């Protein structure tokens, strides 16, 4: 539900690319150019950032069990 | 011995003893959740 | 339920030999090296280094099963030579090659870091 | 206790803060009376609440 | 103004999005329940007869109006409080609302001394409510408000909650009613049989099926008969016509034959006339009919009465049950025979039993109404007897105590809970399968289950005709989504754009027709029926018309303007046969289509503009239908409709194919269901494969719902890192698969690597698995409650003790708390205890009844819940969590039927790689492509490689000419890769290149819940049953495996007798008995005192020991119970 740490195929860190990836998309950047600026050349790492679904952002809409 | 429970609506830590109908003294909610245990559980990052 | 420990692949079991030598009776001057807790990383380099020795008539490696972490290396040499001696020289040659490759890498790293 | 035609929550005129009391209008007069006895003493959001028929325009000499 | 071909692809999908933004995915379920609460229930109450009872004083007890409040719950104190769905799923309650009905009781004794008493808002019973419906608390709530209630905004609803179980009503298919269908059975005494399942508009009795058959040739000719209801003997049609007041054969034929200039039909009916000519009056005909029945009255008077009420009530009730309607029944019965003659003379084609235009879908609306009707009658009944025994004593009665609200509540609760459709007593005559447990394994399964159909033909049936994919499943049902087991073709799945009618009253239509130039049935003369066209309404023959062309043009104009005629109304104008059948009944499956003018569409560009700004100008699908651009077409109307697959077919071609189109498809991909729309390029794969995938998509892991942390479900699989498919269809945006995916995009390489992926198997990357590749978690909820049924024995949650409890296993109970429930965050293994429950005895004065964990679980407690059930007793739920890592044996499957288990897990170092460090996460055997011909798997692997390297999401819409294999190849050659997807790999063990350039790319794979840890089973001297001392059945019971008959036959061929003996006797149920050598009956043995005697023979020395299976000893005992004497003679 949240961006993984490493790429399942190679092992490159991607956990630190999700927030930066979103910050670029809102800046009128293309999904390809954005992935290139982050240093993602292999189509394996690009898969992780382009095929991920941030579901945790929806899980945080529910109040917690403890206040 | 205390067995503090949590609520689903108010999230208030209320004490509930056995043989007592389940009901939140703070909000009256009838569903109670238990608190995380104090035991030391290990998780291997594998 | 049955996931074997990951460290079981590299750690030697108590009372288990790292390497066992069994003389092959089919042909003369041949042996089988059953090494435990290894993989293709060592079998190939030793295999290749053994083929380059002209006194070695047969040099091959196999994995009886991928789930296991052992390896079997067959070595056939000339009557004047010995297979154990070949398995030893092949290692000594590989060690020197890596030592030379290691030193030549530090120099290249140093030359690149400076300019 | 019954369908609500309209609901009016009063707010501070100058501060805009919630007053803490509201007026509930049910579709049928019978639906309200059912709440008079049951609604009184209800617990909403952890705080007990009281409920009585609004006398601002019913009881003579009420203020 | 006109939509150009380049902009069409954007317009069609835009129109589709508006549809799913207003209607939804389960609209057919919500609309059904909605119309049931608004109209059906109110009508069922008003349609009931006032119960007039008298000892004298009399009482009617007439109902006038109803009121259904929101779902509520009453505690022990009685304080009415609202109940949320999350509270019901947790407390195992029933999400139902009370039904309040107004009653008016007037006293009438004598002397016109009347006085009325009204009981406003009388609590008659509770009714379960459909989630997300109009009366549901979650109606109109925003995504934020639903989150406050711990509810998922994406949950489509359409299901109920009974005792905490999410139940969904499966739409049941049935043959249409009030319609004439002429079939022909090959093996029967009748050549052609014309039946008509008749039922009144407001159904109140079962379907009175009437048959109008023709006797097979071999007195003189072929005789026509009629098998009327409540009569066990065929009856000539003429006798029935005379029983209705038509004695003259001319008037009779005038109702059957409308054109006397057709001597072929007159010559075919002559045998029936000459067969019944002694009867020439209505009274004698009625007496004959009553005589043929199974209730022949000794006196001819009541015989005529029995026939009169039968022809007036049971025969064709839909045409009318009142008196003076004999003319309408005859006119219809005449048309019923007219259809039979046309079928025998070849002037008309026989009707197909599979044609869904002749079927109806019984949804929750028409379904729940049948129960409420039958039960409401039982309520008025129980109220009658109760008040009857009170007025007999000459005193008043209180209806508040007469109303047994338990009837409706427990009734609807039982039906929706068990599935048996009917009273609790008729648990065998009722049809099961309805109200199934909602599948919450993935969002696709939930949608499919909520859009599931069912044909009650019986899985036992071996006839392939009803299971075949009929041509009429187009646009209404998914041709691919269907089980592959013993229910092929019977269990279907609605299409994306399929909408089942909710129902409507034909009163306004009949008013418009009467106001029109249409002529009634009783006002016309039979001579005018020849050239005139008939007009039917819900199967009821209303009248005729002269210029039907402008009639439909008018009716169609009215439906397209949201006029008196609603969109759900079907208007079929059969041209060859002058019939014009209009339908307003429910269950008529239909779908939308773009209306077409002379040669152009009505969906101009100004519409697409308004649909783009849908959030601002509130221009939604409803405004599109009202503009006359779209039309809801049903299966029965498709026969008279000429569709166009795409606007390209409307253009001028070198050779005109049709040139007279009247409708057009929004998008051909809409013919697919939910589990089939997720498949990319399904038009490039073998059809069975697309079907097997539709059955796997429901078994794929993922995020079945966003609020999975609050729901305490008994079984739930959650995927760690879900990903949306790089190669996706433009329909997933509406299924919400992008938000709740059920798989991961994997870098798969189609190659043979060590042979561990052969025969539908795959090789996985152990390093990827170590980084969370396809990793998931298994949630299991254990529920328990302490019952205070009586002071004899009471259960209670409390930490058991070895000195007071009796049934305490050797397991340690230290993990439990003083309250008797384990705490979250604790590690629990198999055989461990999570709930310490003790029951008071009549190891003294209390026995242990703790709940242990299933074997081979090794999980951790996620959370614990404690609440009160309906009975005010303590109710605890413990949700255990277990992380399931994909290992050898776990099943994986792509979106094209390519299923297989992980043969072995190779590390990143042992796996192949390209020139760059890209190892394939999965490796499959290419042998699975040619036989299955799943080209879509290859194109998906290609479009995925282009999308990842290009920075987009591949559009794999099934029918899209703008995307082929050539364009994808050219785009891939621009990023430095082979245009055909192939790529050079290096052997990971030796680094040497692979002679064959392997095919590799991203492919969306799925993990299935069918793991090996949940299937691995072993047994060695375990428990046994009670009846027969044989191993148990199931892993939960540590049962053994079945050595079936086929195995007995196999080992017989091998000649292995000892094995066959060891398996069936020594390893299953070895036993020893003592029999008398004289009578061979089991003697009475006592090995402790060493005495053996047979009471029968009175001997105690001629005994013999026999080593026989216990099942055989049980068999002989079961035979001796039938007085059979199986004597085991050892000599
Ligand atoms: Zn990578
Ligand atoms: Zn609370
Ligand atoms: Zn005997």
Q: What does E529-565 look like in DSSP terms, one character per residue?
A: GTTSEEEEETTEEEEEES-HHHHHHHHHHHHHTT-SS
The CA-based dihedral angle spanning residues E231, E232, E236, E241, taken in that order and rounded to the nearest 10 degrees: 0
Please measure the distance between the N-terminal and C-terminal CA atoms of chain B and give it in whole angstroms. Answer: 36
DSSP-assigned beta bridge partners for residue E500: E589
Cβ-based contacts of E988 with chain C (< 8 Å) = 40
Q: Does C touch A (3+ CB pairs < 8 Å)?
A: no
Q: How far is the CA of E470 from the centre of ligand 1 (A)?
A: 47
- Whether B10 has a binding-site annotation, put simply, is yes
Positive or negative CA dihedral for C91, C92, C98, C102? positive
State how far the Cα of E1079 lies from the Cα of E1095, in Å rounded to an integer.
11
State how far the Cα of E646 lies from the Cα of E644, in Å rounded to an integer.
5
**Which residue do the tokens 């860190």 mark?**
A13
CA neighbor of E666 nearest in space, from E641, E650, E643: E643
- Whether B29 has a binding-site annotation, put simply, is yes
B with E: how many residue pairs have Cβ under 8 Å apart? Answer: 62
State how far the Cα of E312 lies from the Cα of E328, in Å rounded to an integer.
11
Residues 6+ apart with CB under 8 A from C55: C77, C78, C80, C81, C86
How far does E1013 lie from chain C, in Å, by closest CA?
7
CA neighbor of E726 nearest in space, from E455, E564, E946: E946
C-beta separation of E809 from E767 below 8 A:
no
**Which residue do the tokens 């022949």 mark?**
E296
Q: Which of C66, C67, C69 is most worth mutating to test chain E (most E CB atoms within 10 A of its CB)?
A: C66
Please measure the distance between the N-terminal and C-terminal CA atoms of chain D and give it in whole angstroms. Answer: 27
Pairwise CB contact (< 8 Å): D43 & B10:
no
E807: helix, coil or strand? coil
Q: Does A touch B (3+ CB pairs < 8 Å)?
A: yes
Annotated catalytic residue, options E760, E890, E921, E1069: E760
Residues 6+ apart with CB under 8 A from E1118: none
Q: Does C touch D (3+ CB pairs < 8 Å)?
A: no
**Which residue do the tokens 């001819």 mark?**
E300
- Burial class of residue E847 in the structure, from the number of CB atoms within 10 Å of its CB (0-12 exposed, 13-18 middle, 19+ buried): buried
Strands of E1061-1130 (E only): list them.
Answer: 1072-1076, 1084-1086, 1091-1093, 1103-1107
Pairwise CB contact (< 8 Å): A63 & E952:
no
Closest CA in chain B for residue A66: B11
State how far the Cα of E647 lies from the Cα of E657, in Å rounded to an integer.
14
Say if strands E827-828 and E859-868 run parallel, antiparallel, or are unpaired: antiparallel
State how far the Cα of E443 lies from the Cα of E705, in Å rounded to an integer.
7
State how far the Cα of C107 lies from the Cα of C102, in Å rounded to an integer.
9
E355: helix, coil or strand? coil
The CA angle C21-C27-C29, to the nearest 5 degrees, is 55
Residues 6+ apart with CB under 8 A from E922: E746, E747, E748, E749, E762, E763, E764, E765, E892, E1003, E1005
- Whether B7 has a binding-site annotation, put simply, is yes
- H-assigned helices in E257-363: 263-275, 282-292, 300-309, 326-344
- What is the per-residue DSSP string for A22-61? HHHHTTT--HHHHHHHTT--SHHHHHHHHSB---HHHHTT
In this complex, which chains have at least 3 CB pairs below 8 Å with chain B? A, D, E
In this complex, which chains have at least 3 CB pairs below 8 Å with chain C? E
Cβ-based contacts of C1 with chain E (< 8 Å) = 856, 858, 1013, 1016
Edge to edge, the sheet with strand E190-198 lists: E181-183, E190-198, E208-215
How far does A44 lie from chain B, in Å, by closest CA?
22
Cβ-based contacts of E986 with chain C (< 8 Å) = none
Number of domains in chain B: 1
Q: Is B27 on the interface with A (CB under 8 A)?
A: no
Domain that holds residue B29: 1-46
3-class SS string, E1097-1111: CCECCCEEEEECCHH
Told to judge if E760 belongs to the known catalytic residues of this protein, a careful annotator would answer yes
Which ligand lies nearest to the CA atom of residue B7 in the structure? 2
- C-alpha distances out from residue E307 to C4, E3, E559, E580, Å: 82, 65, 43, 32
Q: How far is CA C1 from the centre of its chain?
A: 33
Q: How far is the CA of B29 from the centre of ligand 2 (A)?
A: 5
Closest CA in chain D for residue B28: D43
C-beta separation of E343 from E194 below 8 A:
yes
CA neighbor of E851 nearest in space, from E839, E864, E834, E838: E834
How far does E770 lie from chain A, in Å, by closest CA?
8
- Whether E1076 has a binding-site annotation, put simply, is yes
Cβ-based contacts of E991 with chain C (< 8 Å) = 44
What resolution in Å is listed for this PDB structure? 3.6
Pairwise CB contact (< 8 Å): B31 & E865:
yes
How far does B26 lie from chain E, in Å, by closest CA?
16
State how far the Cα of E40 lies from the Cα of E45, in Å rounded to an integer.
9
Q: How far is the CA of E985 from the centre of ligand 1 (A)?
A: 17
Q: Is C7 on the interface with E (CB under 8 A)?
A: no
State how far the Cα of E422 lies from the Cα of E918, in Å rounded to an integer.
61
Pairwise CB contact (< 8 Å): E79 & D42:
yes
* Tokens representing residue E728 in the block: 């996706």
CA neighbor of E129 nearest in space, from E152, E155, E162: E162
Q: How far is CA E90 from the centre of its chain?
A: 25
CA neighbor of E176 nearest in space, from E315, E57, E352, E339: E352
- Burial class of residue C110 in the structure, from the number of CB atoms within 10 Å of its CB (0-12 exposed, 13-18 middle, 19+ buried): exposed
State how far the Cα of C84 lies from the Cα of E374, in Å rounded to an integer.
93
Q: Is E75 on the interface with B (CB under 8 A)?
A: yes
State how far the Cα of A55 lies from the Cα of E103, in Å rounded to an integer.
52
Say if strands E795-797 and E1091-1093 run parallel, antiparallel, or are unpaired: unpaired
State how far the Cα of B34 lies from the Cα of B13, in Å rounded to an integer.
9
How far does D48 lie from chain B, in Å, by closest CA?
8
* Tokens representing residue D3 in the block: 């369908």
Say if strands E761-765 and E899-906 run parallel, antiparallel, or are unpaired: parallel
Positive or negative CA dihedral for E504, E506, E511, E517? positive
Pairwise CB contact (< 8 Å): E69 & D30:
no
Residue E163 is given by DSSP the state T
CA neighbor of E153 nearest in space, from E716, E704, E706, E722: E706
State how far the Cα of C6 lies from the Cα of E764, in Å rounded to an integer.
16
Q: How far is the CA of E910 from the centre of ligand 1 (A)?
A: 17
In this complex, which chains have at least 3 CB pairs below 8 Å with chain E? A, B, C, D
3-class SS string, E808-842: CCCCCCCCECCCCEECCCCEECCCCEEECEEECCC
Residue E868 phi/psi, 5-degree rounding, is -125, 135
CA neighbor of E746 nearest in space, from E918, E920, E904: E920
CA neighbor of E565 nearest in space, from E641, E620, E499, E625: E625
Closest CA in chain C for residue E883: C1
**Which residue do the tokens 């041509």 mark?**
E471
How far does D21 lie from chain B, in Å, by closest CA?
19
Which ligand lies nearest to the CA atom of residue E1075 in the structure? 3
- Residues in chain B, total: 46
Cβ-based contacts of E69 with chain D (< 8 Å) = 2-3
Interface of E with D in 113-152 (CB under 8 A): 120-121
E923: helix, coil or strand? strand
Q: How far is the CA of A58 from the centre of ligand 1 (A)?
A: 26
Way the structure was solved: cryo-EM
Q: How far is the CA of B32 from the centre of ligand 2 (A)?
A: 8
Cβ-based contacts of B5 with chain E (< 8 Å) = 866
Cβ-based contacts of C40 with chain E (< 8 Å) = 910, 988-990
C-beta separation of E741 from E718 below 8 A:
no
Q: Is B13 on the interface with D (CB under 8 A)?
A: no
State how far the Cα of E195 lies from the Cα of E184, in Å rounded to an integer.
11
Q: Is B36 on the interface with E (CB under 8 A)?
A: yes
State how far the Cα of E493 lies from the Cα of E450, in Å rounded to an integer.
9
**Which residue do the tokens 């064709």 mark?**
E316
CA neighbor of E475 nearest in space, from E708, E295, E681, E638: E638
Q: Is E442 on the interface with A (CB under 8 A)?
A: no
Q: Is C41 on the interface with E (CB under 8 A)?
A: yes
Pairwise CB contact (< 8 Å): C41 & E754:
no
CA neighbor of E833 nearest in space, from E843, E823, E846, E825: E823
How far does E741 lie from chain A, in Å, by closest CA?
8
Q: Is B4 on the interface with E (CB under 8 A)?
A: no
Residue E907 phi/psi, 5-degree rounding, is -75, 170
* Tokens representing residue C39 in the block: 């993989």
Residue D45 phi/psi, 5-degree rounding, is 60, 35
DSSP-assigned beta bridge partners for residue E197: E209
C-beta separation of E213 from E193 below 8 A:
yes
Query: Which of E740, E920, E1002 is the closest to A47 by Cβ?
Result: E1002
State how far the Cα of E619 lies from the Cα of E314, in Å rounded to an integer.
50
Pairwise CB contact (< 8 Å): A53 & E738:
yes
State how far the Cα of E396 lies from the Cα of E58, in Å rounded to an integer.
10
- C-alpha distances out from residue E932 to E688, E760, E926, E936, E1002, Å: 9, 11, 11, 11, 20
């Amino acid at each position: 539900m949240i961006i993984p740490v490493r790429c399942f195929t190679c092992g490159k860190i991607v956990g630190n690319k999700w927030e930066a990836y979103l910050g670029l998309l809102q800046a009128e950047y293309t999904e390809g150019d954005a992935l290139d600026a982050l240093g993602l050349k292999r189509y394996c790492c690009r898969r992780m950032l382009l095929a991920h679904v941030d579901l945790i952002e929806k899980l945080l809409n529910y109040a917690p069990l403890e206040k | 011995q205390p067995m503090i429970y949590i609520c689903g609506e108010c999230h208030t830590e209320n004490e509930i003893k056995s043989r007592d109908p389940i009901r939140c003294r703070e909000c009256g909610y009838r569903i109670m959740y238990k608190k995380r245990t104090k035991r030391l559980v290990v998780f291997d990052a594998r | 339920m049955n996931a074997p420990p990951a460290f079981e692949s590299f750690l030697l079991f108590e009372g288990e030999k790292k390497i066992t030598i069994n003389k092959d009776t089919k042909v003369p001057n041949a042996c089988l090296f059953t090494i435990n807790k290894e993989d293709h990383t060592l079998g190939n380099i030793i295999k290749s280094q053994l083929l380059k020795d002209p006194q070695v008539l047969f040099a091959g490696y196999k994995v009886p099963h991928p789930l296991e972490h052992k390896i079997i290396i067959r070595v056939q040499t000339t009557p004047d030579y010995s297979p154990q001696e070949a398995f030893t020289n092949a290692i000594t040659d590989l060690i020197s090659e890596l030592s030379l490759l290691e030193e030549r890498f530090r120099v290249a790293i140093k030359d690149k870091q400076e300019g | 206790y019954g369908p609500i035609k309209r609901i009016h929550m009063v707010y501070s005129k100058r501060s805009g803060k919630p007053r803490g009391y509201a007026f509930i209008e049910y579709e049928h007069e019978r639906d309200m009376h059912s709440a008079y006895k049951h609604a009184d003493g209800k617990k909403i959001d952890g705080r007990r609440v009281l409920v009585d028929v609004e006398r601002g325009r019913t009881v003579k000499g009420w203020r | 103004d006109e939509i150009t071909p380049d902009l069409w692809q954007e317009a069609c999908w835009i129109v589709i999005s508006s549809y799913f933004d207003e209607k939804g995915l389960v609209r057919q379920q919500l609309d059904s329940f909605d119309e049931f609460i608004q109209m059906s229930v109110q009508r069922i109450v008003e349609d009931a007869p006032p119960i007039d009872l008298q000892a004298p004083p009399r009482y009617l007890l007439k109902f006038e109006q109803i009121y259904l409040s929101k779902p509520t719950h009453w505690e022990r104190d009685g304080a009415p409080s609202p109940m949320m769905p999350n509270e019901a799923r947790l407390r195992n309650l029933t999400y139902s609302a009370p039904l309040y009905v107004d009653i008016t009781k007037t006293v009438i004794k004598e002397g016109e001394e009347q006085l009325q008493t009204q009981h406003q808002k009388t609590f008659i019973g509770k009714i379960p409510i459909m989630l997300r419906s109009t009366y549901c608390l979650l109606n109109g709530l925003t995504d934020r408000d639903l989150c406050e209630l711990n509810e998922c905004p994406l949950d489509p609803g359409g299901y109920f909650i009974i005792n905490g179980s999410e139940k969904v009503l499966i739409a049941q298919e049935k043959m249409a009613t009030n319609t004439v269908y002429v079939f022909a059975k090959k093996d029967s005494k009748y050549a052609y049989t014309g039946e008509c399942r008749s039922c009144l508009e407001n159904s109140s009795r079962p379907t009175s099926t009437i048959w109008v058959s023709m006797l097979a040739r071999g007195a003189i000719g072929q005789r026509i008969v009629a098998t009327l209801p409540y009569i066990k003997q065929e009856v000539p049609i003429i006798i029935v016509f005379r029983a209705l007041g038509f004695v003259s054969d001319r008037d009779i034929l005038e109702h059957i034959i409308y054109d006397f200039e057709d001597p072929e039909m007159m010559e075919m009916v002559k045998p029936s006339l000459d067969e019944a000519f002694v009867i020439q009056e209505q009274n004698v005909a009625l007496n004959f009919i009553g005589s043929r029945g199974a209730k022949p009255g000794v006196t001819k008077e009541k015989r005529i009465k029995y026939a009169k009420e039968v022809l007036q009530k049971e025969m064709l009730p839909h045409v009318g049950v009142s008196d003076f309607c004999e003319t309408k029944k005859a006119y219809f019965l005449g048309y019923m025979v007219h259809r039979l003659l046309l079928a025998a003379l070849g002037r008309r084609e026989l009707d197909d039993r599979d044609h869904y235009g002749n079927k109806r879908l019984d949804l929750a609306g028409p379904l729940l109404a049948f129960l409420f009707r039958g039960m409401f009658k039982n309520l008025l009944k129980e109220v009658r007897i109760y008040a009857q025994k009170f007025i007999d004593r000459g005193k008043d009665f209180n209806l508040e105590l007469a109303i047994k609200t338990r009837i409706i509540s427990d009734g609807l609760k039982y039906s929706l809970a068990t599935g048996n459709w009917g009273d609790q007593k008729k648990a065998h005559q009722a049809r099961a399968g309805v109200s199934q447990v909602l599948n919450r394994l993935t969002f696709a399964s939930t949608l499919s289950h909520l859009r599931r159909l069912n044909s009650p033909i019986g899985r036992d049936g071996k006839l392939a005709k009803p299971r075949q994919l009929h041509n009429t499943l187009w646009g209404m049902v998914c041709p691919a989504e269907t089980p592959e087991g013993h229910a092929v073709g019977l269990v279907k799945n609605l299409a994306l754009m399929a909408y089942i009618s909710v129902g409507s009253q034909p009163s306004p239509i009949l008013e418009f027709l009467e106001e029109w130039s249409m002529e009634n049935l009783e006002e016309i003369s039979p001579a005018a029926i020849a050239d005139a066209t008939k007009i039917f309404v819900n199967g009821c023959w209303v009248g005729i018309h002269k210029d039907p062309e402008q009639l439909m043009n008018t009716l169609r104009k009215l439906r397209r303007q949201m006029d008196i005629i609603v969109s759900e109304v079907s208007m079929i104008r059969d041209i060859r046969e002058r019939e014009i059948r209009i339908y307003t009944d429910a269950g008529r499956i239909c779908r939308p289509l773009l209306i077409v003018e002379k040669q152009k569409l009505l969906l101009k560009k100004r519409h697409i503009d308004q649909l783009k700004e849908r959030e601002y100008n509130n221009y939604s699908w409803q405004d599109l239908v009202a503009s006359g651009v779209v039309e809801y077409i049903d299966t029965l109307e498709e026969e008279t409709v000429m569709l166009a697959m795409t606007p390209d077919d409307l253009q001028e071609k070198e050779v005109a194919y049709c040139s007279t189109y009247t409708h057009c498809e929004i998008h051909p991909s809409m013919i697919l269901g939910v589990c089939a729309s997720i498949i990319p390029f399904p038009d490039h794969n073998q059809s069975p494969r697309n079907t097997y995938q539709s059955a796997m998509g429901k078994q794929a892991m993922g995020v079945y719902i966003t609020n999975f942390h609050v729901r305490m479900d008994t079984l739930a699989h959650v995927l760690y890192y879900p990903q949306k498919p790089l190669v996706t269809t433009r329909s997933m945006e509406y299924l919400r698969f992008r938000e709740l995916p059920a798989g991961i995009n994997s870098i798969v390489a189609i190659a043979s690597y060590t042979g561990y992926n052969q025969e539908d198997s795959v090789i996985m990357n152990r390093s990827a698995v170590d980084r969370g590749f396809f990793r998931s978690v298994f949630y299991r909820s254990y529920k328990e409650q302490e019952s205070k049924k009586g002071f004899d024995q009471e259960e209670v949650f409390e930490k058991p003790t070895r000195e007071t409890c009796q049934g305490m296993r050797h397991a340690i109970y230290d993990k439990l708390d003083d309250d008797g429930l384990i705490a979250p965050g604790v590690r629990v293994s198999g055989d461990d205890v999570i709930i310490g429950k003790t029951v008071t005895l009549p190891r003294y004065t209390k026995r242990d009844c703790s709940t242990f964990l299933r074997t081979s679980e090794t999980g951790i407690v996620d959370q614990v819940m404690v609440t009160l059930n309906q009975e005010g007793y303590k109710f605890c739920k413990i949700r255990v969590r277990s992380v399931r890592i994909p290992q050898i044996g776990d099943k994986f499957a792509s979106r094209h039927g390519q299923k297989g288990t992980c043969g072995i897990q190779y590390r990143q170092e042992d796996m192949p790689f390209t020139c760059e460090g890209i190892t394939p996460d999965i490796i499959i055997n290419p042998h699975a492509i040619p036989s299955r011909m799943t080209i879509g798997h290859l194109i998906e692997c290609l479009q995925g490689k282009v999308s990842a390297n290009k920075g987009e999401i591949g559009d794999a819409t099934p029918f899209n000419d703008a995307v082929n294999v050539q364009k994808i190849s050219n785009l891939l050659s621009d990023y430095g890769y082979h245009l055909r997807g192939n790529e050079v790999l290096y052997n990971g063990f030796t680094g040497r290149k692979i002679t064959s350039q392997i095919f590799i790319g991203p492919t969306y794979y799925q993990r299935l819940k069918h793991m090996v840890d949940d299937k691995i089973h072993s047994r060695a001297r375990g428990p046994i049953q009670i009846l027969n001392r044989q191993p148990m059945e199931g892993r939960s019971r540590d049962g053994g495996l079945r050595f079936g008959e086929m195995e007995r036959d196999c080992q017989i061929a091998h000649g292995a007798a000892q094995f066959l003996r060891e398996r069936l006797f020594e390893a299953s149920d070895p036993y020893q008995v003592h029999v008398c050598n004289l009578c061979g009956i089991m003697a009475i043995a006592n090995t402790r005192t060493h005495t053996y005697e047979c009471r029968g023979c009175r001997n105690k020395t001629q005994i013999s020991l026999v080593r026989m299976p216990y099942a055989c000893k049980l068999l002989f005992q079961e035979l001796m119970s039938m007085s059979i004497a199986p004597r085991m003679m050892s000599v």
